[PDB]
Amino acid sequence: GAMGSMERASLIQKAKLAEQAERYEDMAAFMKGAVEKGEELSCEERNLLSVAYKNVVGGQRAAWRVLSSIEQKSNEEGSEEKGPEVREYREKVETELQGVCDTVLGLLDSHLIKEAGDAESRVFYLKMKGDYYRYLAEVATGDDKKRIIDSARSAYQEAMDISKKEMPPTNPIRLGLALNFSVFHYEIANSPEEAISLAKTTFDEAMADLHTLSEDSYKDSTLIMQLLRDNLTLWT
Amino acid sequence: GAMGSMERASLIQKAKLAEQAERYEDMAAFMKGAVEKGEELSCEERNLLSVAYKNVVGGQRAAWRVLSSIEQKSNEEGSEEKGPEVREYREKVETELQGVCDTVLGLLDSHLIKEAGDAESRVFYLKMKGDYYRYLAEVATGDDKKRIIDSARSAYQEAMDISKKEMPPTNPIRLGLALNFSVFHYEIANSPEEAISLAKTTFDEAMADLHTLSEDSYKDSTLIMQLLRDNLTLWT
Amino acid sequence: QRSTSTPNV
Amino acid sequence: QRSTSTPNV
Ligand SMILES: *SCCNC(=O)C1CCN(C(=O)[C@H](C)c2ccc3cc(OC)ccc3c2)CC1
Ligand SMILES: *SCCNC(=O)C1CCN(C(=O)[C@H](C)c2ccc3cc(OC)ccc3c2)CC1
Ligand SMILES: [Mg+2]
Ligand SMILES: [Mg+2]
Ligand SMILES: [Mg+2]
Ligand SMILES: [Mg+2]
Ligand SMILES: [Mg+2]
Ligand SMILES: [Mg+2]
């Protein structure tokens, strides 16, 4: 790896600089290098890893959606034939997206998840595994679509089981996990009723625990709760 | 070049798709491939080349400015020592920026400018040469800062001489050239009075020629004229 | 249009 | 702050 000669602390410092500069491909490369040092990641370091790759894959997902929409229109019953270029370029972006997802999943499997014993780290990483299988699912069409969906579901479910046992219902990682699993149900798994039920139960259980929180924790939890509510409004 | 096996028309088609997807690094690579086919570029193709590289270098310039500001603060008389990382990462982004500028200048020199005989194409390319030397000047600090500035000035001046002879004062390329040369004077050449004089004369001469224009041309010309006015307001 | 997922920290 | 240059077409 091209980051193998850089100090771990220097990689983390440069990841933070790259974030400030909105250089998220660099940020991801720095954080990949930090993970490959082999030590576990702190809470802040896990956040840097997540921010970096979410921004990278986020741009890819947006681009893929634009190209897939153009391609679907080119294949409308009445559209002029335009050659292989739209499909080729959608495939190029898709392959790059799948590569980013495979990179993240590879870091989680070698060896972030297996060394993660605390609930905060293990739930974070299993949620991330679910998320990057979900992004693979968004573009999957072959045999393995079913298996990709089941991999996402399995990761999210393991994360849910741990979070319900080990975290209060207002814990922001627990809330964000439930939010993303509800998106999985609605957008990937053709299960809108499950999505709605999970979002509603998550929201209500958090509401009842807000009284235990400081002002700063209350702000964090209610921000994610509002996203659950936003989706429930979109979905109903 | 990795685009050497792709049809010219396919490269242009994919550049347009990349623009729609906001994938400007891809767009630039496609347009570089199109230029390297060796044929002259049409007006639309020149625009695609410019849009692609302006967006790429624009992100680099923004990132460089953030990192240079952090570095300047680290070197303030009283700042804690933080090691070589800020300088290293600013240098990394700077080198990538210089590489993009060198790539564009290379395409202009091999062989876009020498084959450009019409005023619209020749002024466009010489303006572009001035612009990418100006971006090099923004980060230059060594011996060659003076020579980079003179290269920008020379390209802009040749472009100005042709535009004044061959284009009406409302021509949008002529206007954008004058705008960018005025920015060169103010921001690079320590010549704010020249910047103000050029912006004012350009604005006034265009004003007096607007009566010759159609509604659509009037919209194009007045948009750039407003930018001259915006700068004159900032500068005075 | 599309559902909202967890934003960046 | 900084001067405005020609925008994208
Ligand atoms: S490590 C520093 C202190 N703790 C944290 O930052 C937590 C890290 C893990 N985490 C999350 O990932 C959750 C899902 C999250 C993500 C993004 C958020 C954004 C906002 O507002 C912009 C609010 C809350 C969250 C929560 C929880 C925080
Ligand atoms: S090739 C299609 C018809 N002609 C054009 O598009 C011209 C191409 C060259 N050109 C310019 O580069 C000038 C400097 C320009 C650039 C950007 C602009 C943006 C706007 O509004 C967004 C308006 C005008 C211009 C002009 C002139 C146009
Ligand atoms: Mg070490
Ligand atoms: Mg594919
Ligand atoms: Mg249930
Ligand atoms: Mg051919
Ligand atoms: Mg340097
Ligand atoms: Mg003069």
Residue numbers in the entry:
A (entry chain A), B (entry chain A): -4 to 231
C (entry chain B), D (entry chain B): 255 to 263
Any passages from the paper?
Compounds 5 and 6 were the most effective stabilizers. Compound 5 had a DR50 value >3,000-fold lower in the presence of the C-RAF peptide compared to 14-3-3σ alone and showed a 246-fold stabilization of the 14-3-3σ/C-RAF phosphopeptide complex (KD = 23 μm to 92 nM). The crystal structure of 5 with C-RAF and 14-3-3σ revealed a contact between the naphthalene ring of 5 and the +1 Thr residue of C-RAF. The (R)-methyl group of 5 also seems important for hydrophobic interactions with the methyl of the +1 Thr residue of C-RAF, at a distance of 3.8 Å. An overlay of the C-RAF peptide in the presence of 5 with the apo C-RAF peptide showed no change in conformation of the +1 Thr residue. In contrast, the +4 Val residue of the C-RAF peptide changed conformation to make space for 5. While the conformations of 5 and 7 were quite different, an overlay of the two structures showed that the trifluoromethyl group of 7 occupied the same cavity as the naphthalene ring of 5. Fragments increased the binding affinity of the 14-3-3σ/phosphopeptide complex as much as 430-fold in the case of 6 and 250-fold for our best structurally characterized hit, 5.
